[PDB]
Design a binder for this molecule. Structure first.
Ligand SMILES: CCCCCCCCCCCCCCCCCC(=O)OC[C@H](COP(=O)([O-])OCC(O)COP(=O)([O-])OC[C@@H](COC(=O)CCCCCCCCCCCCCCCCC)OC(=O)CCCCCCCCCCCCCCCCC)OC(=O)CCCCCCCCCCCCCCCCC
Ligand SMILES: CCCCCCCCCCCCCCCCCC(=O)OC[C@H](COP(=O)([O-])OCC(O)COP(=O)([O-])OC[C@@H](COC(=O)CCCCCCCCCCCCCCCCC)OC(=O)CCCCCCCCCCCCCCCCC)OC(=O)CCCCCCCCCCCCCCCCC
Ligand SMILES: CCCCCCCCCCCCCCCCCC(=O)OC[C@H](COP(=O)([O-])OCC[N+](C)(C)C)OC(=O)CCCCCCCCCCCCCCCCC
Ligand SMILES: CCCCCCCCCCCCCCCCCC(=O)OC[C@H](COP(=O)([O-])OCC[N+](C)(C)C)OC(=O)CCCCCCCCCCCCCCCCC
Ligand SMILES: CCCCCCCCCCCCCCCCCC(=O)OC[C@H](COP(=O)([O-])OCC[N+](C)(C)C)OC(=O)CCCCCCCCCCCCCCCCC
Ligand SMILES: CCCCCCCCCCCCCCCCCC(=O)OC[C@H](COP(=O)([O-])OCC[N+](C)(C)C)OC(=O)CCCCCCCCCCCCCCCCC
Ligand SMILES: CCCCCCCCCCCCCCCCCC(=O)OC[C@H](COP(=O)([O-])OCC[N+](C)(C)C)OC(=O)CCCCCCCCCCCCCCCCC
Ligand code: SF4
Ligand code: SF4
Ligand code: SF4
Lengths: 376, 55, 145, 176, 70, 155, 317, 115
């Protein structure tokens, strides 16, 4: 189905078109990601997280990177953290662009989809400029980013961020004031306060329900403490509130870009500890310690001390986290991925009750279910 | 980069000054012929007093 | 006044594109009538144009050649006739044509850039690049001893 | 700090209520989306003319692998197998042999793209910049056996794609 | 470049042209210049039979004026 | 000459075929979202003359984009067999080409070709929107290079 | 005589074909895309390319389908759309018809029956549901469409389509029944099954609605049928409200004016298709029975006493 | 018989289109292609089970209302009579009667989807 948002088997036991049961058979995409995680080293494990959810490229390994070096008792350089949060906010824009437009795609009108995918492609343009590829950067690594941004990249970021605020207003003009959008959306799918966090929901799902919680503010990570921004808090917990919070989060994301752009500090790009981060190419071809470390780092990987951690960041959907469990060797032992969609799709049965077959099409888009992440 | 008359039409149908800045990109971007960089050294690049046991 | 200005721009368009024959050639093959400065012309006949005044991503463009290595391509085309020196300029990986500064010429680089040979008999085939590992004991040539 | 998103009780004033009634009876906010959509129609489309026109790229782009060689002609690879040890999908298979002279490079260097991930890890793992992620995204084909290259074509790919990467690593050697 | 839209309309508008004047031209041709006479009531229909009968060639669309009578 | 006539009708058939082929709205993993990236106004799927239709009774070319799994396998073969002839299949990304990053995984079939015939293997992981848009072009060239009614004449 | 029939039928098919191009192209320009332009100049050859490829595509006959029922419906859909083009008051109508609108209304209701039958004839969920959403869609618009139709022509004098040109004459009819045209235009949107009211198709909700088992030629007759339906009923709303002047000595002067009136109005049908989300057929019968019906009575009462109000009873002849 | 000629031509022209779209464009069916569509998987097995309405109440009211509009179709001719006084009252009386029936159903629930 095009409204399936990818692949899943959603069996409805419905009379007329009132859905009585909506059992979401999941796993049609299943890759044993955590199992292949077990056999690869931490450096080889980085691209795995980049492919959990197809909406947030480096928001994921940001959680994975935070899992490793914080367990390693190592911190990234201050400049690197600013790059991470800047691109994490750009990544936050990446999901929200089709978290709302593809929502509108299944809802009906297709033009909003093509309005902002142009601007979404520009964020891909800087993505490919500063990283190796368009989507799967493998950029954010434990101990810091892979390499420095190209010269002139920030100026392009400034122009795009300058032009972007004039585009959420384009979507919001199209949809928010529209009665046709509103009627299909307002009061269609509601969660109360208690069942919201009882069902394990996170991010927009709680924020739309008025729950006063956001990971960036409550449990700041990286350099997010110094940045200043607002978190939109819903009042009804319905689809209209969540879409409105998603729109406002995009505007607040742009403000974070402005502060990040004007507060980029000088310094390096990765932790100076060469045992956790590869040394520079010039030193690797000249100095012994750089070469021997580069050889062993790119053949064994940094030895992570034994232990367990549950670092979780504010993913654009929810509280995407990883329960990294290290046995002390150069490869991880267990790594279970916390998927905000997993809880959101679990609650899909609770959301759809008395609504019709077109409304459940609205709900499975308001949680922004992605099936590489909801399924792992 | 179009006629003035339609620019009024687009500016009035959308009710906003789109001509100040547009979705498409133009020569305001940075040229892709950057001079060679001079990437900095790290804090631990000190030539002395850099024993690993202290960091 | 601006209305007839764009009308003469079209009248300039047909005139500048080699009269009627060239305009109908590019309209039906190049799918576009825009006119740009002749930035360069490689050895394969591929005609290249540059228009810095247009919006980004439509500044540098290519009119493909009608012949390449006996693979007549006047009508059909693909994104692989571009030679390596110019392929970076087309994708604006750089703001320099190879004409301004040619790449460092060395012995081993190809003299004739090729395209996807898939489907054609020149297509690649996987094969073992290693020698035999366990050679068998050769039977004796002599008859029964 | 937080910003409340959705509550604004509408004024029940005669002027304000007839605004909502006029908005309801006479579709006004409804035609607002209709009207702006007209304004966006007159915008010239942002479509490139493929393959006559190709999208913007950057020097640090990951494409098809291409084994390069020294200016003298000797291929850079020295069979350290670091690319094989790092390759997150084990797309590299390496065998080595000291043949006669200063040219023991590979018995076998097979890169398996349909297994490969295009992470580029092999490129910066190489101590001699032998294996690189080329700038050519355009290497599609019709047969599955095509999508894997042998060691020879990696050399041919590095031979055929030589000017682009030589300039690309020239511009990017300080960044990495 | 919405002026590329107009070629779609140009043929389409011309495509909508054909059944318009043709339905007038064939009516003009089959009725000899004068337009197709319509008969929504008995009086009009009873007329066409009288015009068909009086003409003497069994055509309603050929009319004899004052020269017919003497 | 009969061969001249059959060639002319041959030219009519493939030109309509390659101009008006309709990719399936089918998407599985990372490749699918980049597939709709080029459908965005930057690269304009539709300007090449194609439109997205949903059901098998609707489309021309299957566009397999994403990881193929054991559980996904029965439906993909069912939906592919459900497409009326002529029908073509292109294989997005390393994962669908064969195995991919999860080639060794227990829950991934090593190759969409192991399940469905494939015309073109478009590489990249994810393939850039440029690369696969050529893959459609290569299929247009491949559709051009046929002799369906011509081989019938000499059959 | 038959030469007039072919000149009435054949141009519509080409006009319908070129509607697919503009459908895919003005939408794209209205969507930052460039639309089909690779096939011939500016894509004008694409409608041809669609036609042969669809015809040469394999027809499909699902195993659980009723064969005779599967074939009669596509015939009914295309034939009614084509025969819908005979009675319009285009300067010289093919058939003068005392009950012009009743002929218009009767088979417009029969048109949905082809839409209706194909759903179950294909024998699956995704078409049975789409067929039943066609029931509710025509539950809504039909109960009111006759009321708007009666109201607008009650000032005309009779049901004859030809008298519309005489009735309008000096000024546009919309100037006298603008809230009726508000009623009429988007209710035609609700019968043509276009974007805001295309629940019978339902792209996102149920794959394709009453089209899922249809392939190749049956669609080609179905695609042309609903494209012919929108243009014809738009030409109906063109004369109903925007009728131009007609000089008997120069009938071609009416054609050029009428064609643009039904063409610019058509651009609207493509205009709403881009900008508006989808009505759920719940609110579709809800809206057309909650606000639409009570309102359309009021102007119907307004439009009957008002000819008696000002002694402006139109003549029947 | 002019309407018959165009009706005959119209249904004929439709029949040629289905005729050459069923024989000319090849034929190859191997069962699973011929099978019904269930978004990729195999249906539960039916398409014939009662698909009970949830709006059955409004369906019958449509019959009453679509019937009663046929009572006021003669309105354009009913205006041109010598007795527009009783014509005005009677024709008005019908519209209030439909209005009352719609109002009656509206108040006692009705139009809203029965659950
Ligand atoms: C109402 C529509 C009236 C006709 C179209 C008028 C129109 O839009 O002209 C373009 C013209 C300028 O558009 P623009 O986007 O500012 O042009 C920017 C560049 O100069 C554009 O640069 P350029 O290089 O594109 O300029 C050349 C361009 C210029 O193209 C034109 O000027 C279009 C007219 C044909 C020449 O011509 C072409 O590109 C050649 C291809 C033409 C394709 C076929 C066009 C058919 C038009 C209809 C013909 C009759 C049916 O439009 C106007 O000035 C609007 C006038 C509206 C008048 C309404 C009267 C009622
Ligand atoms: C009223 C007259 C009804 C006449 C009649 O028997 O209609 C059966 C007709 C076909 O029923 P079905 O459920 O599609 O089953 C057809 C085969 O039995 C089951 O499908 P099939 O694939 O076996 O259909 C082919 C089959 C049956 O023949 C046909 O389906 C050909 C068309 C009907 C011929 C009678 O051919 C033969 O048995 C050999 C024919 C020599 O049922 C109808 O409701 C059609 C009535 C059409 C009336 C005229 C409309 C204008
Ligand atoms: C029922 C059956 C009825 C049968 C009637 C008989 C005729 C039917 C078919 C008529 C059109 C045939 C197709 C012509 C186009 C074609 O195939 O071009 C192939 C080829 C395609 O070449 P190509 O493959 O190189 O194009 C794509 C690749 N690029 C974009 C890089 C060029 O084009 C031509 O041959 C060029 C000339 C085409 C001229 C078409 C007509 C132009 C004028 C139209 C006016 C309005 C008409 C309405
Ligand atoms: C080339 C074609 C050129 C001509 C195009 C004409 C149609 C589109 C015109 C522009 C769009 C309409 C204006 C708009 O979107 O915003 C301005 C405004 C937006 O209004 P608003 O939604 O901000 O509310 C206005 C009222 N106050 C200020 C009190 C809140 O448009 C209007 O007010 C116009 C209302 C149109 C109503 C449509 C139905 C009646 C039409 C006439 C009878 C038939
Ligand atoms: C209006 C359309 C005008 C042009 C129509 C051209 C004919 C198209 C018919 C459908 C395709 C089959 C065809 O061309 O010949 C049938 C012929 C039939 O004989 P055939 O033996 O070639 O069929 C294919 C091979 N078998 C039988 C094993 C499946 O098929 C082909 O040409 C396809 C190769
Ligand atoms: C379905 C066909 C419906 C035909 C129809 O409604 O015709 C109305 C029209 C209404 O006619 P009328 O009421 O306009 O009067 C006829 C005379 N003129 C047109 C000059 C005023 O019917 C006819 O014209 C009668 C001729 C055909 C009679 C036989 C029809 C058989 C239909 C079988 C199906
Ligand atoms: C006119 C209405 C025609 C309805 C049937 C259309 C049609 O051809 O259906 C396919 C059916 C079946 O087509 P068919 O007969 O080609 O299918 C079976 C073919 N064999 C026997 C070789 C296996 O047409 C007639 O039954 C000069
Ligand atoms: S990008 Fe390089 S290292 Fe990574 S899988 Fe591909 S070939 Fe191996
Ligand atoms: S390509 Fe580089 S990393 Fe790989 S074996 Fe050769 S020298 Fe070592
Ligand atoms: S090939 Fe890469 S982008 Fe495509 S589905 Fe597999 S992991 Fe995702």
């Amino acid at each position: 189905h095009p409204a399936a948002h990818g692949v899943l088997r959603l069996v409805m036991e419905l009379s007329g078109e009132m859905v009585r049961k909506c059992d979401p058979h999941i796993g049609l995409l299943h890759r044993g990601t955590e199992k292949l995680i077990e056999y690869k080293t931490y450096l080889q494990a980085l691209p795995y997280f980049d492919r959990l959810d197809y909406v947030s490229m480096m928001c994921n390994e940001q959680a994975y990177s935070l899992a490793v070096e914080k367990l390693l008792n190592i911190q990234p350089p201050p400049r690197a953290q600013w790059i991470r949060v800047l691109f994490g906010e750009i990544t936050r824009l990446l999901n929200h662009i089709m978290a709302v437009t593809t929502h509108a795609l299944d809802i009906g009108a297709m033009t909003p989809f093509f309005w902002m995918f142009e601007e979404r492609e520009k964020m891909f343009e800087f993505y490919e400029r500063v990283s190796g590829a368009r989507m799967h950067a493998a950029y954010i690594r434990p101990g810091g980013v892979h390499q420095d941004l190209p010269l002139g990249l920030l100026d392009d970021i400034y122009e795009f961020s300058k032009n972007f605020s004039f585009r959420i207003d384009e979507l919001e003009e199209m949809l928010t004031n529209n009665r046709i959008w509103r009627n299909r959306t307002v009061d269609i799918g509601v969660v109360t306060a208690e069942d919201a966090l009882n069902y394990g929901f996170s991010g927009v799902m709680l924020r739309g329900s008025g729950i006063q919680w956001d990971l960036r503010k409550t449990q700041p990570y990286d350099v997010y403490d110094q940045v200043e921004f607002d978190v939109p808090i819903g009042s009804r917990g319905d689809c209209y509130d969540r879409y409105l919070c998603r729109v406002e989060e995009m505007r607040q994301s742009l403000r974070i870009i402005s502060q990040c752009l004007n507060k980029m500090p000088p310094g390096e790009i990765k932790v100076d500890d060469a045992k956790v981060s590869p040394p520079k190419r010039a030193e690797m071809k000249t100095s012994m310690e750089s070469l021997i470390h580069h050889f062993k780092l790119y053949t064994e990987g940094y030895q992570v001390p034994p232990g367990a951690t549950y670092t979780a960041i504010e993913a654009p959907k929810g509280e995407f986290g990883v329960y990294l469990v290290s046995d002390g060797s150069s490869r991880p032992y267990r790594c279970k991925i916390k998927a905000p969609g997993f809880a959101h799709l679990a609650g899909l049965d609770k959301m759809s009750k008395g609504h019709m077959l077109a409304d459940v099409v609205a709900i499975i888009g308001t949680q922004d279910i992605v099936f590489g992440e909801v399924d792992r | 980069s179009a006629t003035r008359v339609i620019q009024l039409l687009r500016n009035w149908a959308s009710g906003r000054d789109l001509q100040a800045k547009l979705q498409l990109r133009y020569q305001e971007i940075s040229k892709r012929t950057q001079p060679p960089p001079k990437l900095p050294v790290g804090p631990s690049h000190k030539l002395s007093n850099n024993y690993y046991c202290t960091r | 006044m601006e209305l007839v200005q764009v009308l003469r721009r079209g009248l300039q368009q047909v005139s500048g594109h080699g009269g009627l024959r060239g305009y109908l050639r590019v309209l039906f093959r190049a799918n576009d009538v825009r006119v740009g400065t002749l930035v360069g012309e490689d050895k394969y006949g591929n005609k290249y144009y540059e228009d810095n005044k247009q919006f980004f991503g439509r500044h540098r463009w290519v009119i493909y050649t009608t012949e390449m290595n006996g693979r007549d391509t006047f009508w059909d085309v693909d994104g692989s006739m571009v030679p390596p020196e110019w392929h970076r300029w087309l994708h604006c990986m750089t703001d320099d044509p190879p004409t301004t500064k040619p790449p460092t010429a060395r012995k081993y680089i190809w003299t004739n850039h090729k395209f996807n040979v898939s489907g054609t008999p020149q297509q690649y085939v996987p094969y073992s690049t290693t020698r035999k590992k366990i050679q068998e004991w050769v039977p004796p040539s002599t008859p029964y001893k | 700090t937080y910003k409340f998103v959705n509550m604004r009780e509408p004024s029940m004033d005669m002027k304000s209520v007839t605004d909502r009634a006029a908005q309801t009876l006479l579709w006004t906010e409804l035609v607002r989306g209709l009207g702006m959509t007209l304004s966006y129609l007159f915008r010239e489309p942002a479509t490139i003319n493929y393959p006559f026109e190709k999208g913007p790229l950057s020097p640090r782009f990951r494409g098809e692998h291409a084994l390069r060689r020294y200016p003298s002609g000797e291929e850079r690879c020295i069979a350290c197998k670091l690319c094989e040890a790092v390759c997150p999908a084990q797309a590299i298979t390496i065998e080595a042999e000291p043949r006669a002279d200063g040219s023991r490079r590979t018995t076998r260097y097979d890169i398996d793209m349909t297994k490969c991930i295009y992470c580029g890890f092999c490129q910066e793992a190489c101590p001699v910049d032998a294996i690189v992620e080329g700038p050519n995204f355009e290497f599609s084909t019709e047969t599955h056996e095509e999508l894997l290259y042998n060691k020879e074509k990696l050399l041919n790919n590095g031979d055929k794609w030589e000017a682009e990467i030589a300039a690309n690593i020239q511009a990017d050697y300080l960044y990495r | 470049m919405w002026f590329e839209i107009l070629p779609g309309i140009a043929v389409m508008a011309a495509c909508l042209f054909i059944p318009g004047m043709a339905t007038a031209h064939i009516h003009k041709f089959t009725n000899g210049g004068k337009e197709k006479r319509v008969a929504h009531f008995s009086y009009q229909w009873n007329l066409m039979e009288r015009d068909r009968c009086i003409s003497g060639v069994n055509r309603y669309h050929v009319t004899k004026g004052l020269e017919n009578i003497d | 000459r009969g061969e001249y006539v059959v060639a002319k009708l041959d030219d009519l058939v493939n030109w309509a075929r390659r101009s008006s082929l309709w990719p399936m709205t089918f998407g599985l993993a990372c490749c699918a979202v980049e597939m709709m990236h080029m459908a965005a106004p930057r690269y304009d799927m539709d300007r090449f003359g194609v439109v997205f239709r949903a059901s098998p009774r609707q489309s021309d070319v299957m566009i397999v984009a994403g990881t193929l799994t054991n559980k996904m396998a029965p439906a993909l073969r069912k939906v592919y067999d459900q497409m009326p002839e002529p029908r073509y299949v292109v294989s997005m990304g390393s994962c669908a080409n064969g195995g991919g990053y999860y080639h060794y995984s227990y829950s991934v079939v090593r190759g969409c070709d192991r399940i469905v015939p494939v015309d073109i293997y478009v590489p990249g992981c994810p393939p850039t929107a440029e690369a696969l848009l050529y893959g459609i072009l290569q299929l247009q060239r491949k559709i051009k290079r046929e002799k369906r009614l011509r081989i019938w004449y000499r059959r | 005589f038959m030469i007039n029939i072919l000149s009435l039928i054949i141009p519509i098919l080409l006009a319908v074909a070129f509607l697919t191009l503009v459908e895919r192209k003005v939408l794209g320009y209205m969507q930052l895309r460039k639309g089909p332009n690779v096939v011939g100049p500016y894509g004008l050859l694409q409608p041809i390319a669609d036609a042969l490829k669809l015809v040469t595509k394999e027809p499909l006959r699902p195993g659980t389908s009723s064969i005779s029922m599967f074939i009669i419906a596509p015939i009914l859909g295309l034939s009614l759309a084509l025969t819908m083009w005979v009675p319009l008051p285009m300067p010289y109508p093919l058939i003068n018809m005392n009950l012009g609108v009743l002929f218009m209304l009767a088979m417009s209701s029969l048109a949905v029956y082809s839409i209706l039958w194909s759903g179950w004839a294909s024998n699956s969920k995704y078409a049975l549901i789409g067929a039943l959403r066609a029931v509710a869609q025509t539950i809504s618009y039909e109960v009111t469409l006759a009321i708007i139709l009666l109201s607008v022509l009650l000032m005309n004098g009779s049901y004859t389509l030809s008298t519309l040109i005489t009735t309008q004459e000096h000024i546009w009819m919309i100037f006298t029944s603008w809230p009726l045209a508000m009623m009429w235009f988007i209710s035609t949107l609700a019968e043509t099954n276009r974007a805001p009211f295309d629940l019978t198709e339902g792209e996102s909700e149920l794959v394709s609605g009453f089209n899922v088992e249809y392939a190749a030629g049956p669609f080609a007759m179905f695609f042309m049928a609903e494209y012919a339906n929108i243009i014809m009923m738009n030409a109906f709303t063109a004369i109903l409200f925007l009728g131009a002047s007609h000089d008997p000595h120069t009938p071609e002067l009416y054609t050029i004016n009428f064609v643009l009136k039904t063409l610019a109005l058509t651009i609207t049908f493509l205009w709403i298709r881009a900008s508006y989300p989808r009505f759920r057929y719940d609110q579709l019968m809800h809206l057309l029975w909650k606000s639409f019906l009570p309102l359309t009575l009021a102007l119907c009462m307004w439009h009957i006493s008002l000819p008696i109000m000002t002694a402006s009873i139109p003549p029947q002849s | 018989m002019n309407i018959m000629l165009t009706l005959l031509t119209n249904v004929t022209l439709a029949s040629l289109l289905v005729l050459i779209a069923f024989w000319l464009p090849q034929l190859n069916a191997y069962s699973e292609k011929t099978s019904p569509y269930e978004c990729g998987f195999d249906p539960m097995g039916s398409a014939r089970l009662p698909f009970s309405m949830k709006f059955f109440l409004v369906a019958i009211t449509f019959l009453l209302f679509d019937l009663e509009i046929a009572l006021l179709l003669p309105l354009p001719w009913a205006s041109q009579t010598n007795n527009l006084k009783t014509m005005l009252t009677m024709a008005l009386f019908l519209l209030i009667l439909l209005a009352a029936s719609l109002a009656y159903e509206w108040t006692q629930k009705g139009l809203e989807w029965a659950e």
